[PDB]
């Protein structure tokens, strides 16, 4: 029977790019932990400004105060500088980020505050330094691990672009050599990595481009071993698109729901979306949508997966891969507030991208959020998160479209007695809706957010509200 | 005040090339420890014959029975296949050898039997996969570790021999990129590696080509930190030649005494040395020596270093780097027995190269000794080791040349009351010596080995003996 972690159904996730989050407020002995202070100046690399895991641990005050109870990262394992997606050693948190020691301290500091931590697993490819590929570059045909990868001919040309690489790399890039997952050895190796970190204490896995590993039975085994070590462990696939193939209950607990992000932005932002700023590969926040259109595709999205899994989906509006919220919408604040509102009132776990909560800009490849806040946008986030953690219906309640006409959208979230009405007016003019709400046994008349069985609801332009009771 | 480990002064060392020592007598789950047996056949690399650390642990019976009480290895850290001297990760025992787990079991099994273990430290250079060099190959000029190595210009050509590497490699080889030890960071990194394994439990360090690291103060610091973790830890430099520079008491406890090996072989083997089989870079077992000549250069070698250090020298007759004993002497058994005799009766710790003890051949680049023994040569070894562990004088006693004329050599080892006379007749004919031995207070007349104050000693051709009392 389909079962997903319960803590996830009630969590608020917060995606961090550690390299560019926060510096520690203290001089840190990263890498060379034994080095004495007198030598500090002699050591240029240690002495002299990127973000690290110390930093995040130090800013747990801020993160918790925002209302966050679970942070998940981009890839943090040892890898070359500015290339965290080209794994060198999966068993080691990168030295510059503070290594396993710094990670262990952050991990404990988080758990002490009851904040979960999920890591990114880049298992489709590694790097040219990854040990077993290293052995292949050194021994060629004689290397015993040739069959661990996808070699096409000899000789290989790892670094000289003037000659054919002769081995398959992600997106045709030599620095991203792919794994031969069909090989039961490669598979066993991936599984053992997954198990290790769960034993270490992480609260589960983000899966990078998991749809590339096509070996049948691969992800069910992944789920089996994973849950074996931690039955409450959260397995999220980063998949852009219909993810039914992996959401049958035997693989992931959910995916990063870009199917939610596209329509939500296309409706809240409308024709204000800055096209040259949309990572069209991930989501489609265009063409602009009218209330009735947002309503049908949203319901279509809500009946795509089993309800238990829908509740553990990772809803988002941005990621390391896309532009920030303020940027995708040409600085239109209302687009941010309206979008965030739909995000924090959607069934499934919400995910806030670090920086968005302070109105920080960001195109498709900026950081250090705690360094000019957009107070308004910040308050919208904190307040909405408090409200989501205050009413169970907003987390695991059902979802009912009440009204969707023109540019005005109304739906209700209900759990037992609790009934909440959420309204969105994406239009440039004030609007009112007359609705026959006989599906509700109460009459939500109290404003829990914003300003505003027969109901007459009037909303100001580009505004949303939450009605309680 | 100069002080070296005491256990070393009474140990008998046994040099092993793990890859080619012994296979485990059991199917082993190296690398993928979690893999289930049903998959064994699906895993070609695991299922299908090199030596490993399991194997050595299983053959501790044999090693201890030989009389060995300390084994030291060639490089065993993670590295490409057939290239153990090109380190990939210093913090990991190579997967194929059984990893840290297998090493941990061998380490404990040895210590339970009171047998020490010394590892080889290759700190002058690493490999192209070594993480920080990896970062340099990936980021070039922008890599933050450029100054960790010896880059000469851009761009670098790591694997394409048709273009200049542009970075310094050991002996001009690109696969062996050198470290910039002058960099206090590189140095701190080396030191931390050294400390780690000592904390792990190893009984000290063999230092590979340490004379290449010229940074002043480097080896004194190495000694300081090392002994800090384990005051009884054995620091041996692999240096071929006058090692006074490093044997002043602030650096090594001793070196692999090739200054002993050269003359010893040149005398015991004489013109039977097979020139095309001598690694002339390490030692010079030519031209052949007459007794009187062996005597003067041996005394010259015995007054080269402080006595406390001479007692912890690692005397040997062969290494991974040279030809085996049976091979260097054209299969002349007497050369082996005579040489081994001089080795086991010399002041300082003796080192036996695995295979030599069974007459195994070996040119300058064969293994698996426990697989046709030369019983005679084996008995000579075991017996001589038993005799060395039986009389303290043979270990830490003084050294006095009694007679050296023609092809007949006599010396005594004395400790307190104990006085031992060792005789060598390298000649092809029977010989007798008349000596005035007034330096001794006893008259050694008992044969403890071999067949034979005024003394008349007669020795058969190509033979040696030990006289007790």
Q: How far is B163 from chain A (nearest CA, A)?
A: 10
Q: A34, B192: Cβ pair inside 8 Å? A: yes
CA dist., res. B322 & res. B280, Å (int):
9
The active-site residue, picked from A238, A332, A356, A419, is A238
CA dist., res. A315 & res. A55, Å (int):
26
Cα angle B60, B65, B67; round to 5: 105
Q: Write the CB contacts of A111 (distance below 8 Å, at least 6 apart in sequence).
A: A117, A201
Nearest to B23 by CA among B117, B99, B109, B97: B97
CA dist., res. A5 & res. A9, Å (int):
7
Query: Which CATH superfamily does the domain covering B391-469 fall into?
Result: Golgi alpha-mannosidase II (2.60.40.1180)
Cα angle B246, B250, B256; round to 5: 40
CA dist., res. B465 & res. B469, Å (int):
13
Beta-carbon pairs below 8 A across chains A and B = 129
CA dist., res. A4 & res. A7, Å (int):
9
Chain B segment 254-283 residues within 8 A of A by beta carbon are none
Q: Which two tokens stand for residue A126?
A: 């590694």
Q: Write the CB contacts of B92 (distance below 8 Å, at least 6 apart in sequence).
A: B77, B78, B99, B100
Whether residue B41 lies within 8 A of chain A, CB to CB, comes out as no
CA dist., res. B98 & res. B95, Å (int):
5
Spatial contact of A247 and A309, defined as CB atoms under 8 Å apart: yes
Q: B32, A185: Cβ pair inside 8 Å? A: yes
Q: How far is A175 from chain B (nearest CA, A)?
A: 8
Phi-psi region of B456 (alpha: psi -120 to 50; beta: other; left: phi over 0): beta
Query: DSSP character for A246?
Result: G
| End-to-end C-alpha distance for chain B, whole angstroms | 36
Q: B43, A138: Cβ pair inside 8 Å? A: no
Residue A195 is among the residues annotated as catalytic for this protein: no
* β B13-16/B70-73 pair status: parallel
Residues in chain B closer than 8 A to A157 (CB atoms): 159-160
CA dist., res. A394 & res. A10, Å (int):
9
Nearest to A112 by CA among A73, A65, A57: A57
Chain A segment 170-209 residues within 8 A of B by beta carbon are 175, 184-185, 188-189, 191-192, 195
The interaxial angle of helices B258-268 and B333-344, nearest 10 deg, is 140
Q: B45, A144: Cβ pair inside 8 Å? A: yes
With 0-12 / 13-18 / 19 or more C-beta atoms within 10 angstroms meaning exposed / middle / buried, residue A316 is: buried
Nearest to B345 by CA among B406, B393, B296, B312: B393
Q: Write the CB contacts of A296 (distance below 8 Å, at least 6 apart in sequence).
A: none
Work out the widest C-alpha separation in chain A, in whole angstroms: 78
Residue ranges covered by each domain of chain A? 1-390, 391-469
Q: Write the CB contacts of A97 (distance below 8 Å, at least 6 apart in sequence).
A: A18, A19, A30, A52, A53, A76, A103
Chain A segment 60-79 residues within 8 A of B by beta carbon are 78
Q: Write the CB contacts of A292 (distance below 8 Å, at least 6 apart in sequence).
A: A404, A405
Cα B413 to Cα A400, B347, B402, B403, B410: the distances in Å are 99, 8, 10, 13, 10
> Helical H runs in A274-425?
291-302, 307-310, 325-328, 333-344, 375-390, 393-396
Strands annotated E in B209-319: 234-237, 254-257, 314-315
Q: How far is A323 from chain B (nearest CA, A)?
A: 26
Chain A segment 111-170 residues within 8 A of B by beta carbon are 127-129, 131, 134-135, 137-139, 142-145, 147, 157-160, 163
Q: B185, A144: Cβ pair inside 8 Å? A: no
- Please give the resolution of this entry in Å, rounded to 1 decimal: 2.4
CA dist., res. B39 & res. B32, Å (int):
11
DSSP character string of A280-295:
TTT----S---HHHHH
Element holding A15 (H helix, E strand): strand A13-16
Cα B66 to Cα A199, B108, B381, B416: the distances in Å are 43, 19, 8, 28
> Helical H runs in A161-281?
184-200, 218-229, 258-268
Nearest to A336 by CA among A464, A458, A423: A464
Around Cβ B398, how many Cβ atoms within 10 Å? Answer: 14
Distance of CA B275 to the CA centre of its chain: 22
- Backbone phi, psi, residue B432, to 5°: -135, 145
* Cis bond upstream, residue A155 (ω within 30): yes
Spatial contact of A237 and A210, defined as CB atoms under 8 Å apart: yes
Query: DSSP character for B25?
Result: S
Q: Write the CB contacts of B129 (distance below 8 Å, at least 6 apart in sequence).
A: A129, A131, A134, A135, A137, A138, B80, B88
Place of tokens 């780097």: B321
Query: Which CATH superfamily does the domain covering A1-390 fall into?
Result: Glycosidases (3.20.20.80)
Cα angle A269, A275, A280; round to 5: 100
* β A13-16/A349-353 pair status: parallel
Whether residue A42 lies within 8 A of chain B, CB to CB, comes out as yes
Q: Write the CB contacts of A6 (distance below 8 Å, at least 6 apart in sequence).
A: A232
Query: DSSP character for A88?
Result: E
Nearest to A336 by CA among A356, A307, A306: A356
Nearest to B137 by CA among A50, B148, B121: B148
CA dist., res. A328 & res. A336, Å (int):
9
Around Cβ A227, how many Cβ atoms within 10 Å? Answer: 17
Place of tokens 């299969």: B331
Q: Which two tokens stand for residue B143?
A: 């890599």
Q: How far is A80 from chain B (nearest CA, A)?
A: 5
- Backbone phi, psi, residue B167, to 5°: -150, 140
Strand, helix or coil at A221? helix
Of B32, B142, B158, the CB nearest to A192: B32
CA dist., res. A462 & res. A466, Å (int):
14
Residues in chain A closer than 8 A to B32 (CB atoms): 185, 188-189, 192
Place of tokens 């058969």: B460
Q: Write the CB contacts of A446 (distance below 8 Å, at least 6 apart in sequence).
A: A467, A468, A469
Distance of CA A181 to the CA centre of its chain: 25
Q: How far is A124 from chain B (nearest CA, A)?
A: 18
DSSP character string of A223-254:
HHHHHHH-TT-EEEE---S--GGG-SSSS-SE
Around Cβ A101, how many Cβ atoms within 10 Å? Answer: 14
Residues in chain A closer than 8 A to B31 (CB atoms): 189
Strand, helix or coil at B334? helix
CA dist., res. A288 & res. A126, Å (int):
39
Size of chain B in residues: 469
Work out the widest C-alpha separation in chain B, in whole angstroms: 78
């Amino acid at each position: 029977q389909i079962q997903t972690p319960d803590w996830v159904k009630h969590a608020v996730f917060y995606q961090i790019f550690p390299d560019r989050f926060a510096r520690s407020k203290q001089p840190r002995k990263r890498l060379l932990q034994e080095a004495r202070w007198e030598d500090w100046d002699s050591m240029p690399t240690l002495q002299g400004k990127g973000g690290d895991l110390w930093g995040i641990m130090e800013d747990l005050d801020y993160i918790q105060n925002l209302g966050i109870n679970a942070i998940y990262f981009t890839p943090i394992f040892q890898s070359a500088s500015n290339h965290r997606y080209h794994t060198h050693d999966y068993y080691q948190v990168d030295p510059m980020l503070g290594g396993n020691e710094a990670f262990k301290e952050l991990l404990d500091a988080a758990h002490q505050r009851n904040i979960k931590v999920v890591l990114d697993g880049v298992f489709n490819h590694s790097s040219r330094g990854f040990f077993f590929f290293h052995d292949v570059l050194e021994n060629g045909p004689h290397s015993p691990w040739v069959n661990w990868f996808k070699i096409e001919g000899w000789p290989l040309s790892p670094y000289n672009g003037e000659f054919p690489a002769n081995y398959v790399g992600w997106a045709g890039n030599r620095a991203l050599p792919e794994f031969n997952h069909d090989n039961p050895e490669v598979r066993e190796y991936i599984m053992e990595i997954a198990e290790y970190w769960l034993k270490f204490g992480i609260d589960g896995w983000r899966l990078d481009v998991p749809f590339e590993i096509k070996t049948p039975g691969f992800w069910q085994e992944f789920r089996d071993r994973t849950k074996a070590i931690n039955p409450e462990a959260y397995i999220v696939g980063e998949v852009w698109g219909d993810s039914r193939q992996w959401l049958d209950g035997t693989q992931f607990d959910g995916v990063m729901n870009y199917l939610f992000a596209g329509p939500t932005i296309a409706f809240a932002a409308g024709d204000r979306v800055v096209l040259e700023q949309v990572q069209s590969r991930d989501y489609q926040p265009y063409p602009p949508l009218f209330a009735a259109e947002y309503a049908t595709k949203i319901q279509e999205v809500l009946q795509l997966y089993p309800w238990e899994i829908q509740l553990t989906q990772l809803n988002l509006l941005a990621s390391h891969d896309t532009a920030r919220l303020m940027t995708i919408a040409g600085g239109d604040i209302a687009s941010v507030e309206l979008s965030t509102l739909l995000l924090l009132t959607f069934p499934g776990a919400p995910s806030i991208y670090y920086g968005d909560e302070v109105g920080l800009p960001g195109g498709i490849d900026r950081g250090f959020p705690l360094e000019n806040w957009n107070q308004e946008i910040f308050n919208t986030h904190r307040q909405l998160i408090t409200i989501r953690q205050t009413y169970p219906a907003l987390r695991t309640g059902d979802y009912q479209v009440l009204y969707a006409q023109g540019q005005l959208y109304l739906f209700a979230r209900t759990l037992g007695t609790e009934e909440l009405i959420i309204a969105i007016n994406a239009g440039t003019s004030s609007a009112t809706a007359n609705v026959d709400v006989a599906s509700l046994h109460t009459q939500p008349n109290k404003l829990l957010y914003g300003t505003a069985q027969q109901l007459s609801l009037t909303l100001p332009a580009r505004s949303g509200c939450i009605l309680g009771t």
